[PDB]
């Protein structure tokens, strides 16, 4: 049903010691598959399916865009410095554009930008006009409307983006459609007169998972602390929840784990 393509850039003035200033990255269904670097100057695959099922002209043609996309962002950084009347320092340019599809057809199409952690511009496809969030982005709105780049973006977001996305899903249908089961461990420790239990699901896929604490067969969303869902190195996800409770009450609490991989939601109890 729902498949999402998203490309993302990050041009930086002060990236750090021994780090690249510009990086361009792509994501399919919330999973990293394509990567570009300013040091390497070539697009490279992160997943197996995109690497296996792609010719050289795909990479060479994509690299020419990446080397292009690197060059404009060098010019951009300099343009904003003069527009804001800034001497220099730690500034960054961000780009965020993609396309969503449901049962074949497209639903959403976006093309945005932010400067120094704040929205700069955004392409509204329905009205066929770019929006100026900040007074410093008003010149860009006039530039991008006079020269109809909006016609070019509509062609990309609706036609180009979708045709490539359908192909990417077909290549990694097995690797996107797979399901991995979470290795769950329950543990608790005394803090300062208060027992602090903690459920910890390790390696699982897909991303969205529901983990909660059940006191006496009843969901307790009070006193529960969660750190959200966080990624791993090998294309899988991790989560963690903890609950403050009275000492001795160990058998009362239970960690329920609801996930797509599991048909029945598995309950876990603390037993050492």
């Amino acid at each position: 049903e729902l498949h999402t393509l998203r490309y993302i850039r990050t041009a930086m003035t002060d990236p750090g010691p021994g780090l690249p200033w510009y990086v361009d990255v792509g994501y399919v269904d919330g999973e990293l598959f394509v990567h570009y670097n300013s040091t390497a100057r070539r697009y490279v695959p992160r997943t197996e399916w995109i690497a296996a099922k792609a010719d050289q002209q795909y990479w060479d043609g994509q690299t020419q865009i990446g080397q292009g996309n690197e060059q404009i962002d060098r010019e951009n950084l300099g343009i904003l410095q003069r527009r804001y009347n800034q001497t220099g320092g730690s500034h960054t340019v961000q780009w965020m554009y993609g396309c969503d599809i449901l049962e074949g057809g497209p639903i959403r199409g976006y093309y945005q930008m932010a400067y120094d952690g704040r929205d700069f511009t955004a392409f509204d496809k329905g009205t066929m006009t770019f929006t100026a969030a900040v007074p410093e982005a008003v010149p860009t709105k006039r530039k991008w409307e006079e020269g109809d780049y909006a016609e070019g973006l509509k062609q990309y977001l609706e036609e180009t983006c979708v045709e490539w996305l359908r192909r990417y899903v077909e290549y990694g249908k097995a690797e996107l459609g797979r399901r991995e089961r979470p290795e769950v461990r329950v543990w608790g420790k005394e803090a300062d007169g208060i027992l602090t239990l903690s459920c910890r699901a390790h390696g699982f896929y897909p991303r969205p998972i529901v983990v909660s604490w059940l006191k006496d067969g009843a969901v307790r969303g009070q006193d529960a602390h969660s750190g959200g869902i966080v990624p791993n190195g090998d294309g899988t996800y991790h989560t963690w929840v903890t609950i403050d409770a009275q000492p001795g009450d160990g058998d009362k609490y239970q960690c329920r784990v609801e996930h797509a991989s599991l048909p029945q939601p598995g309950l876990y109890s603390w037993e050492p």
Partner: peptide
Amino acid sequence: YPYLGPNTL
């Protein structure tokens, strides 16, 4: 597949 440009700000 990425989109080239279109142009500077």
